Scaffold this active site. Structure first.
Site, PDB file in Angstrom:
ATOM      1  N   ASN A 276       3.673  -9.265   6.956  1.00 34.14           N
ATOM      2  CA  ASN A 276       4.152 -10.609   7.314  1.00 34.14           C
ATOM      3  C   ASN A 276       3.000 -11.541   7.714  1.00 34.14           C
ATOM      4  O   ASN A 276       2.290 -11.195   8.650  1.00 34.14           O
ATOM      5  CB  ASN A 276       5.183 -10.513   8.472  1.00 34.14           C
ATOM      6  CG  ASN A 276       6.214  -9.426   8.262  1.00 34.14           C
ATOM      7  OD1 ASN A 276       7.098  -9.548   7.430  1.00 34.14           O
ATOM      8  ND2 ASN A 276       6.107  -8.354   9.037  1.00 34.14           N
ATOM      9  N   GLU A 309      -3.055  -4.097   4.516  1.00 31.40           N
ATOM     10  CA  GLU A 309      -2.271  -5.214   4.990  1.00 31.40           C
ATOM     11  C   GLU A 309      -3.059  -6.504   4.924  1.00 31.40           C
ATOM     12  O   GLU A 309      -2.498  -7.543   4.586  1.00 31.40           O
ATOM     13  CB  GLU A 309      -1.773  -4.991   6.403  1.00 31.40           C
ATOM     14  CG  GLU A 309      -0.872  -3.796   6.550  1.00 31.40           C
ATOM     15  CD  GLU A 309       0.165  -3.691   5.461  1.00 31.40           C
ATOM     16  OE1 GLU A 309       0.839  -4.694   5.179  1.00 31.40           O
ATOM     17  OE2 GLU A 309       0.336  -2.589   4.905  1.00 31.40           O
TER      18      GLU A 309
HETATM   19  N1  LIG Z   1       4.101   4.274   3.153  1.00 31.37           N
HETATM   20  C1  LIG Z   1       5.431   3.813   2.979  1.00 31.37           C
HETATM   21  O1  LIG Z   1       6.379   4.414   3.463  1.00 31.37           O
HETATM   22  C2  LIG Z   1       5.664   2.550   2.204  1.00 31.37           C
HETATM   23  C3  LIG Z   1       6.425   2.790   0.888  1.00 31.37           C
HETATM   24  C4  LIG Z   1       5.615   3.520  -0.160  1.00 31.37           C
HETATM   25  C5  LIG Z   1       5.175   4.834   0.057  1.00 31.37           C
HETATM   26  C6  LIG Z   1       4.417   5.509  -0.904  1.00 31.37           C
HETATM   27  C7  LIG Z   1       4.107   4.861  -2.097  1.00 31.37           C
HETATM   28  C8  LIG Z   1       4.549   3.556  -2.324  1.00 31.37           C
HETATM   29  C9  LIG Z   1       5.299   2.879  -1.360  1.00 31.37           C
HETATM   30  N2  LIG Z   1       4.390   1.886   2.021  1.00 31.37           N
HETATM   31  C10 LIG Z   1       3.860   1.186   3.029  1.00 31.37           C
HETATM   32  O2  LIG Z   1       4.332   1.195   4.163  1.00 31.37           O
HETATM   33  C11 LIG Z   1       2.643   0.348   2.733  1.00 31.37           C
HETATM   34  C12 LIG Z   1       1.361   1.042   3.204  1.00 31.37           C
HETATM   35  C13 LIG Z   1       1.203   2.488   2.752  1.00 31.37           C
HETATM   36  C14 LIG Z   1       0.838   2.677   1.324  1.00 31.37           C
HETATM   37  C15 LIG Z   1      -0.214   1.986   0.720  1.00 31.37           C
HETATM   38  C16 LIG Z   1      -0.553   2.218  -0.595  1.00 31.37           C
HETATM   39  C17 LIG Z   1       0.179   3.150  -1.318  1.00 31.37           C
HETATM   40  C18 LIG Z   1       1.227   3.859  -0.740  1.00 31.37           C
HETATM   41  C19 LIG Z   1       1.548   3.617   0.590  1.00 31.37           C
HETATM   42  C20 LIG Z   1       0.075   3.143   3.454  1.00 31.37           C
HETATM   43  C21 LIG Z   1       0.327   4.317   4.151  1.00 31.37           C
HETATM   44  C22 LIG Z   1      -0.733   4.940   4.779  1.00 31.37           C
HETATM   45  C23 LIG Z   1      -2.025   4.418   4.713  1.00 31.37           C
HETATM   46  C24 LIG Z   1      -2.294   3.253   4.008  1.00 31.37           C
HETATM   47  C25 LIG Z   1      -1.227   2.618   3.395  1.00 31.37           C
HETATM   48  C26 LIG Z   1       2.777  -0.947   3.530  1.00 31.37           C
HETATM   49  P1  LIG Z   1       3.100  -2.389   2.484  1.00 31.37           P
HETATM   50  O3  LIG Z   1       2.215  -3.458   3.064  1.00 31.37           O
HETATM   51  O4  LIG Z   1       2.943  -1.935   1.060  1.00 31.37           O
HETATM   52  C27 LIG Z   1       4.780  -3.076   2.608  1.00 31.37           C
HETATM   53  N3  LIG Z   1       4.864  -4.123   1.557  1.00 31.37           N
HETATM   54  C28 LIG Z   1       5.872  -2.034   2.394  1.00 31.37           C
HETATM   55  C29 LIG Z   1       7.277  -2.601   2.626  1.00 31.37           C
HETATM   56  C30 LIG Z   1       8.304  -1.544   2.263  1.00 31.37           C
HETATM   57  C31 LIG Z   1       7.978  -0.192   2.352  1.00 31.37           C
HETATM   58  C32 LIG Z   1       8.904   0.793   2.019  1.00 31.37           C
HETATM   59  C33 LIG Z   1      10.162   0.448   1.562  1.00 31.37           C
HETATM   60  C34 LIG Z   1      10.481  -0.909   1.463  1.00 31.37           C
HETATM   61  C35 LIG Z   1       9.563  -1.902   1.803  1.00 31.37           C
HETATM   62 ZN   LIG Z   2       1.468  -3.184   0.120  1.00 28.65          ZN
END
Ligand SMILES: NC(=O)[C@H](Cc1ccccc1)NC(=O)[C@H](CC(c1ccccc1)c1ccccc1)CP(=O)(O)[C@@H](N)CCc1ccccc1
Ligand SMILES: [Zn+2]
Ligand SMILES: *[C@@H]1O[C@H](CO)[C@@H](O[C@@H]2O[C@H](CO)[C@@H](O[C@@H]3O[C@H](CO[C@H]4O[C@H](CO)[C@@H](O)[C@H](O)[C@@H]4O)[C@@H](O)[C@H](O[C@H]4O[C@H](CO)[C@@H](O)[C@H](O)[C@@H]4O)[C@@H]3O)[C@H](O)[C@H]2NC(C)=O)[C@H](O)[C@H]1NC(C)=O
Ligand SMILES: *[C@@H]1O[C@H](CO)[C@@H](O[C@@H]2O[C@H](CO)[C@@H](O[C@@H]3O[C@H](CO[C@H]4O[C@H](CO)[C@@H](O)[C@H](O)[C@@H]4O)[C@@H](O)[C@H](O[C@H]4O[C@H](CO)[C@@H](O)[C@H](O)[C@@H]4O)[C@@H]3O)[C@H](O)[C@H]2NC(C)=O)[C@H](O)[C@H]1NC(C)=O
Ligand SMILES: *[C@@H]1O[C@H](CO)[C@@H](O[C@@H]2O[C@H](CO)[C@@H](O[C@@H]3O[C@H](CO)[C@@H](O)[C@H](O[C@H]4O[C@H](CO)[C@@H](O)[C@H](O)[C@@H]4O)[C@@H]3O)[C@H](O)[C@H]2NC(C)=O)[C@H](O)[C@H]1NC(C)=O
Ligand SMILES: *[C@@H]1O[C@H](CO)[C@@H](O[C@@H]2O[C@H](CO)[C@@H](O[C@@H]3O[C@H](CO)[C@@H](O)[C@H](O)[C@@H]3O)[C@H](O)[C@H]2NC(C)=O)[C@H](O)[C@H]1NC(C)=O
Ligand SMILES: *[C@@H]1O[C@H](CO)[C@@H](O[C@@H]2O[C@H](CO)[C@@H](O[C@@H]3O[C@H](CO)[C@@H](O)[C@H](O)[C@@H]3O)[C@H](O)[C@H]2NC(C)=O)[C@H](O)[C@H]1NC(C)=O
Ligand SMILES: *[C@@H]1O[C@H](CO)[C@@H](O[C@@H]2O[C@H](CO)[C@@H](O[C@@H]3O[C@H](CO)[C@@H](O)[C@H](O)[C@@H]3O)[C@H](O)[C@H]2NC(C)=O)[C@H](O)[C@H]1NC(C)=O
Ligand SMILES: *[C@@H]1O[C@H](CO)[C@@H](O[C@@H]2O[C@H](CO)[C@@H](O)[C@H](O)[C@H]2NC(C)=O)[C@H](O)[C@H]1NC(C)=O
Ligand SMILES: *[C@@H]1O[C@H](CO)[C@@H](O[C@@H]2O[C@H](CO)[C@@H](O)[C@H](O)[C@H]2NC(C)=O)[C@H](O)[C@H]1NC(C)=O
Ligand SMILES: *[C@@H]1O[C@H](CO)[C@@H](O[C@@H]2O[C@H](CO)[C@@H](O)[C@H](O)[C@H]2NC(C)=O)[C@H](O)[C@H]1NC(C)=O
Ligand SMILES: *[C@@H]1O[C@H](CO)[C@@H](O[C@@H]2O[C@H](CO)[C@@H](O)[C@H](O)[C@H]2NC(C)=O)[C@H](O)[C@H]1NC(C)=O
Ligand SMILES: *[C@@H]1O[C@H](CO)[C@@H](O)[C@H](O)[C@H]1NC(C)=O
Ligand SMILES: *[C@@H]1O[C@H](CO)[C@@H](O)[C@H](O)[C@H]1NC(C)=O
Ligand SMILES: *[C@@H]1O[C@H](CO)[C@@H](O)[C@H](O)[C@H]1NC(C)=O
Ligand SMILES: *[C@@H]1O[C@H](CO)[C@@H](O)[C@H](O)[C@H]1NC(C)=O
Ligand SMILES: [Br-]
Ligand SMILES: [Br-]
Ligand SMILES: [Br-]
Ligand SMILES: [Br-]
Ligand SMILES: [Br-]
Ligand SMILES: [Br-]
Ligand SMILES: [Br-]
Ligand SMILES: [Br-]
Ligand SMILES: [Br-]
Ligand SMILES: [Br-]
Ligand SMILES: [Br-]
Ligand SMILES: [Br-]
Ligand SMILES: [Br-]
Length: 870
Positions: A276, A309
């Site tokens: 956000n 982010e």
């Molecule tokens: N980690 C999560 O649960 C979700 C959903 C997800 C998980 C795995 C792959 C793709 C998407 N992702 C997020 O919260 C990422 C970070 C994550 C991540 C980054 C790259 C790839 C995969 C995950 C992360 C985790 C640890 C360290 C660094 C980054 C944060 P975001 O800013 O993308 C945000 N736009 C997600 C909103 C949302 C999330 C799940 C359902 C509905 C809506």
């Molecule tokens: Zn993202």
């Protein structure tokens, strides 16, 4: 449903667009309700009688409609269509093109008890005093449940937010607070500055008790917030944020445009984080950090997610996709910038290993038939939710990696800077990105026609290579296992001549096949350098043999990424069938001579996958023989490991990976060493520090006892480090006692001792090993409706839960069972990609056994089992 609702599609009409929202809210955290008023400045672009809009869960008390010219406060009619989350205001007179109108909706609602929408929860102090908290999580489709709005990314507008809050609480929003006004009782009315033009899914507000750690960065105030008890744990996040901010501003050449930047650790939060504008939100476990309680891995996690982010502030906030079909333009880019920025200014973390591992996994997913193209139509809320998966994130960023590698770094950065300038505060679709590349490219290469197949076709090519003398014969085809179109592929390749000099080049395969001129005779050749390309390579038998022989002679002519590649590809190809599984185990025999993390963890991955498949089929003896073989193969690296935090981050990750492998399967005497450490930690009431790199292992082994399990639980419900609690929770959920495993899941689904944000993780962990295998899946089925109440179809959490509790199933009988279960939910649920991918993974498990079981049984016939056979 509603043929009497004046709109049918899921995309809103274009006829009316919002310019400004003034939103004032009165949340009551105690009663968990809120009253609201939203004023929406709109403009008509076509003649129309209906304003179509989004709203759900709203008790709407008054709706007024004002012609801007007329300035008299009318009443207007309202219709509802809950299925599409839409409402319609029918206007007294027709709206005229180019006229301005003001729309005012007063309403009451519930504060959500999920993790989605405007939600709220209570947590507990060190003081054992109950505290309340409210936060927003709107992406993708929840803004409409907090207020009526045009809830689609392309409708950007400005927002004025007003929150009424108890004096003790702090309110935050996207923009700086403009003013406060004291109200009757102990109430304060907060008003935030008018925001910049943005999407509704980015609007955010928070009410709760917090402290801040702040720093000026050239006029931007950067602040980390946390609950008071935790504020000591934010120093690393602040220092990191400041570094990455300066970096991103220099790279994009566009300043972050707000006067404040807030990063908030929320006590209870389902995603890892959320971008956000001006009010980035995180799980506590992904933003807080303490060197003495947090592992190396935990430090990487915090650095990575902050980079991610921050990148979104440009890719996602400043520039936004028109619609969810192009989600990857956000998430792919942000993921690419996450790993790019860390490689520039946090090179020591070796975050490139994570990038590489995640791509391996995304490819396995992408190779399934139930994959979509990375840019594919979304026509329901389920499909919108389903976009938030590893394809959009990791295939999207690996498309960009391919492009950056192939063009130049500078050519890449030029394209990027044009792109962000041209579309600032506006909306984009796939073609705009390729257009910006085409402008920098000097139409030497038509990037749009190069990326066509990569973005509109599912999967990726299998590239087949065969050395015919001094030339490589090359082919492409769809990679998949059965039961179209050509890619433009940047083929890189590195090679060694007879005189031991190394040559490397790039060509571009446009056609079905091609020949590459090698210039000399070569010993070996390796295609797809560092896996900068998104494809798998299969060699002819002579050419596999050459790479496999060179690894046995001197593996370091290739990079660790190169050797990780090869290990991955040969195992995925033995799964398809293009090579005997024996060939894959030939290739990893070199591992005795391997000192890098990436190839070792990739091999440990394939081994564990196979081990866990055999274990669940009941082939216990065969599965023990397998890890015994692999253990003997890595015996020297495993035995030379110390139980400390010494070494480079990468070497610290290898220690954890290796010790974890030995303790889990009860190999060597690592269990004995771990238990000694646990008992000494426990008898000191958790005082005698454990090295953070061996905690999970030490805790896992302690938790195998009643006395240890109980003691760990006691620590989990009372210590202040969320990083340590997570390692503890993994240990608890690794117990072999079924009653305990059941208790962990049931507790977490209800809240109580574990938050529901830990539930997918607890179920994952329980379902992975033998005692809890049947238990996790059963848990998912029996609580299916309560899960869907907390996590909609088909969001990331549900797909995680379904996948993690079904992917180790390898019989026709389980296939029928899983299929029958989902068919009894509804035809809609059974047709979800989530469900279809699970059914497909199981079918592949079944075919894998029927191809490799007798092979494996034969290869391991002389090895020593650890368990008694039945
Ligand atoms: N980690 C999560 O649960 C979700 C959903 C997800 C998980 C795995 C792959 C793709 C998407 N992702 C997020 O919260 C990422 C970070 C994550 C991540 C980054 C790259 C790839 C995969 C995950 C992360 C985790 C640890 C360290 C660094 C980054 C944060 P975001 O800013 O993308 C945000 N736009 C997600 C909103 C949302 C999330 C799940 C359902 C509905 C809506
Ligand atoms: Zn993202
Ligand atoms: C094994 O190790 C664990 C650590 O994990 C120990 O657990 C700690 O136990 C201590 C002592 O019982 C706990 O301390 C208590 O904390 C309460 C909450 O403190 C907050 O609130 C106060 C004001 O409310 C703030 O000033 C403070 O900074 C915190 O923000 C206090 O309310 C308690 O105070 C009362 O008792 C003490 C006497 O012990 C008096 O001095 C006080 O004036 C008051 O009467 C107390 O301070 C601590 O919370 C526990 N930590 C954790 C992480 O659980 C175990 O004690 C240890 N086991 C053994 C056998 O040693
Ligand atoms: C530390 O902090 C300062 C201020 O925050 C930064 O200095 C600013 O740098 C930015 C960007 O480089 C400047 O904003 C830009 O100015 C450029 C020129 O604007 C000047 O010149 C025009 C020419 O017509 C004059 O009329 C006008 O008075 C301005 O003084 C613009 O070209 C910039 O680009 C674009 O604006 C947006 C930005 O993305 C785009 O959408 C447009 O396409 C347009 O091209 C932008 O307007 C700002 O003026 C600088 N401030 C000062 C005081 O010099 C430092 O860079 C920063 N250092 C860090 C973060 O390390
Ligand atoms: C939501 O509705 C609830 C009722 O359902 C309502 O709850 C009450 O809120 C006030 C918050 O101000 C609480 O009152 C406090 O009581 C404690 C004693 O328990 C006082 O210490 C509090 O603080 C100070 O009071 C003044 C400053 O506020 C100072 O002069 C004084 O020195 C204290 O520092 C405060 O008086 C009350 O406990 C709750 N009650 C319940 C049952 O929760 C809440 O206000 C509503 N919120 C909104 C935003 O409408
Ligand atoms: C309908 O309402 C919109 C706004 O809700 C009007 O659009 C905008 O109106 C303002 C005028 O107040 C323009 O802003 C500017 O004022 C500032 C001074 O603060 C100055 O920076 C600018 O040069 C301009 O004067 C704004 O540009 C304008 N935008 C557009 C696209 O027109 C719109 O005029 C209204 N339409 C009606 C009443 O028919
Ligand atoms: C800013 O981005 C806009 C997009 O909003 C750019 O406009 C786009 O310009 C490209 C050329 O680079 C156009 O591509 C061409 O389109 C025609 C029409 O069919 C096609 O036949 C050609 O083969 C070619 O692909 C593109 O259509 C156009 N898109 C839009 C929506 O206008 C603009 O160039 C960018 N501005 C700057 C200053 O860089
Ligand atoms: C992991 O193991 C490999 C192999 O054991 C290590 O590679 C070896 O690295 C040393 C120094 O980095 C190399 O010696 C040097 O060779 C170059 C080129 O001939 C020369 O300029 C130096 O004077 C020195 O002779 C050695 O050749 C190389 N071995 C192989 C087979 O390539 C690697 O360093 C180890 N990595 C870690 C982190 O321990
Ligand atoms: C929605 O809220 C409205 C009020 O905003 C509730 O309607 C009533 O409110 C009036 C005063 O505004 C009282 O006369 C009534 O007592 C309220 N209704 C009841 C049943 O007590 C209305 O009940 C709410 N609607 C729903 C479906 O909950
Ligand atoms: C918490 O935030 C405040 C600002 O919101 C930081 O300090 C402020 O500094 C500005 C300018 O000097 C003033 O407008 C505020 O009055 C200051 N606030 C306070 C409380 O002094 C403050 O430093 C931040 N806290 C920490 C620990 O960094
Ligand atoms: C090893 O042999 C290769 C070729 O067999 C040599 O590389 C070529 O050198 C000629 C000039 O002598 C260049 O014109 C070619 O472009 C080179 N080939 C490539 C593929 O670059 C190389 O010099 C020899 N090196 C040693 C150490 O013997
Ligand atoms: C129990 O396990 C430990 C592993 O840490 C053994 O100590 C290491 O043994 C290997 C093989 O002799 C050496 O290569 C290491 O250098 C030893 N110490 C380290 C790495 O600190 C221990 O010997 C094992 N127990 C027995 C009886 O052999
Ligand atoms: C809030 O939840 C309660 C639960 O029964 C319900 O009665 C009430 O109507 C809800 N308010 C809404 C949906 O606006
Ligand atoms: C963590 O430990 C190191 C040395 O053991 C110490 O220097 C550092 O200050 C500790 N971290 C904190 C937050 O105290
Ligand atoms: C694969 O999915 C496509 C839709 O993308 C479908 O038409 C086809 O029947 C499926 N084929 C197999 C073999 O599963
Ligand atoms: C390949 O390149 C070498 C030198 O670059 C040249 O001598 C040879 O003729 C080329 N082969 C073909 C088939 O063009
Ligand atoms: Br209000
Ligand atoms: Br207190
Ligand atoms: Br919702
Ligand atoms: Br990179
Ligand atoms: Br679409
Ligand atoms: Br929808
Ligand atoms: Br390349
Ligand atoms: Br050992
Ligand atoms: Br219990
Ligand atoms: Br119970
Ligand atoms: Br498999
Ligand atoms: Br043999
Ligand atoms: Br057996």
């Amino acid at each position: 449903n509603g043929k009497l609702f004046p709109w049918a599609q899921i995309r809103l009409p274009t006829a009316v667009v919002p310019l400004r929202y003034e939103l004032s809210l009165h949340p009551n955290l105690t009663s968990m309700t809120f009253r609201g008023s939203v004023t929406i400045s709109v403009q008509a672009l076509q003649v129309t009688w209906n304003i179509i809009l989004h709203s759900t869960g709203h008790n709407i008390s008054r709706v007024t409609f004002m012609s801007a010219v007329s300035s008299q406060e009318k009443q207007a009619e309202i219709l509802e269509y809950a299925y599409h989350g839409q409402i319609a205001i029918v206007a007294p007179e027709a709206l005229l093109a180019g006229h301005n109108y003001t729309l005012k909706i007063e309403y009451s609602a519930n504060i959500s008890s999920s993790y989605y929408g405007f939600y709220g929860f209570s947590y507990t102090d060190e003081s054992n005093e109950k505290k309340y908290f409210a936060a927003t999580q709107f992406e993708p489709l929840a803004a409409r449940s907090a207020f009526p709005c045009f809830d689609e990314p392309a409708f950007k507008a400005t927002f004025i937010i007003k929150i009424i809050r108890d004096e003790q609480y702090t309110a935050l929003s996207n923009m700086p607070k403009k003013s406060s006004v004291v109200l009757d009782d102990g109430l304060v009315q907060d008003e935030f500055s008018e925001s910049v033009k943005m999407s509704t899914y980015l609007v955010a507000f928070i009410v709760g008790e917090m402290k801040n750690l702040s720093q000026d960065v050239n006029g931007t105030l950067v602040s980390i917030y946390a609950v008071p008890e935790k504020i000591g744990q934010v120093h690393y996040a602040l220092e990191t944020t400041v570094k990455l901010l300066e970096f991103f501003q220099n790279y994009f050449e566009i300043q972050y445009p707000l006067k404040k930047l807030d990063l908030v650790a929320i006590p209870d939060f389902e995603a890892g984080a959320m971008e956000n504008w001006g009010l980035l939100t995180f799980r506590e476990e992904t933003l807080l950090y303490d060197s003495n309680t947090s592992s190396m891995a935990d430090r990487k996690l915090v650095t990575k997610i902050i980079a991610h982010e921050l990148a979104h502030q440009w890719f996602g906030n400043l520039v936004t996709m028109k619609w969810w079909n192009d989600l990857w333009l956000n998430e792919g880019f942000a993921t690419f910038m996450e790993y790019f920025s860390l490689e520039k200014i946090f090179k020591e973390l070796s975050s490139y290993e994570d990038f590489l591992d995640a791509r391996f996994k995304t490819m396995k997913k992408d190779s399934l038939n139930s994959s979509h193209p990375i840019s594919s139509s979304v026509q329901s809320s389920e499909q919108i939710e389903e976009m938030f998966d590893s394809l959009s994130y990791f295939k999207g960023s690996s498309l960009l990696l391919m492009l950056k590698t192939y063009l130049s770094e500078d050519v890449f950065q030029h394209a990027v800077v044009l792109y962000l300038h041209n579309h600032s505060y506006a909306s984009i679709q796939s073609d705009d990105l390729w257009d910006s590349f085409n402008e920098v490219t000097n139409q030497t290469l038509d990037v749009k026609r190069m990326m066509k197949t990569w973005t509109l076709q599912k999967g990726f090519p299998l590239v087949t290579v065969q050395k015919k003398g001094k030339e490589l014969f090359i082919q492409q085809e769809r990679f998949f296992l059965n039961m179209s179109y050509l890619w433009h592929i940047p083929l890189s390749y590195v090679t060694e001549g007879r005189n031991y000099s190394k040559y490397q080049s790039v060509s571009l395969l446009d056609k079905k096949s091609g020949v590459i001129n090698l210039t000399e005779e070569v010993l070996w050749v390796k295609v797809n350098i560092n896996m900068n390309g998104y494809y798998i390579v299969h060699y002819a038998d002579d050419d596999w043999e050459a790479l496999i022989h060179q690894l046995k002679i001197n593996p370091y002519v290739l990079s660790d990424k190169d050797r990780a590649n090869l290990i991955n590809n040969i195992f995925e190809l033995a799964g398809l069938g293009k090579v005997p599984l024996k060939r894959a185990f030939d290739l990893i025999n070199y591992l005795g001579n391997e000192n890098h993390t990436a190839p070792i963890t990739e091999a440990l991955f394939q081994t564990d996958l196979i081990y866990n498949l055999l274990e669940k089929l009941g082939y216990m003896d065969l599965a023990s023989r397998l890890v015994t073989r692999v253990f003997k193969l890595l015996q020297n690296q495993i035995q030379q490991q110390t139980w400390t935090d010494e070494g480079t981050p990468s070497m610290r990750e290898l220690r954890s990976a290796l010790l974890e492998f030995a303790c889990t399967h009860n190999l060597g005497n690592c269990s004995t060493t771990a238990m000694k450490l646990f008992d000494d930690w426990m008898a000191s009431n958790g005082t005698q520090s454990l090295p953070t790199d061996v905690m999970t292992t030490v805790f896992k082994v302690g938790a195998k006892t009643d006395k240890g399990w109980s003691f760990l639980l006691g620590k989990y419900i009372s210590i202040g480090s969320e990083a340590e609690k997570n390692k503890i929770l993994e240990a608890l959920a690794s117990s072999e006692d079924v009653r305990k495993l059941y208790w962990l899941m049931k507790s977490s689904l209800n809240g109580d001792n574990f938050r529901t944000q830990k539930l997918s993780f607890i179920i994952r962990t329980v379902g992975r090993h033998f005692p809890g295998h049947l238990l996790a899946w059963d848990f998912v089925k029996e609580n299916w409706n309560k899960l869907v109440q907390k996590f909609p179809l088909g969001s990331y959490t549900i797909q995680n839960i379904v996948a993690g509790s079904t992917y180790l199933f390898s019989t026709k009988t389980h296939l029928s069972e899983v299929q029958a279960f989902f068919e009894n939910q509804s035809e809609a649920t059974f047709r979800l990609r989530c469900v279809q991918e699970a059914l497909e993974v199981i079918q592949l498990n079944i075919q894998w056994m029927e191809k490799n079981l007798k092979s494996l049984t034969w290869w391991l016939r002389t090895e020593t089992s650890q368990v008694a056979p039945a």
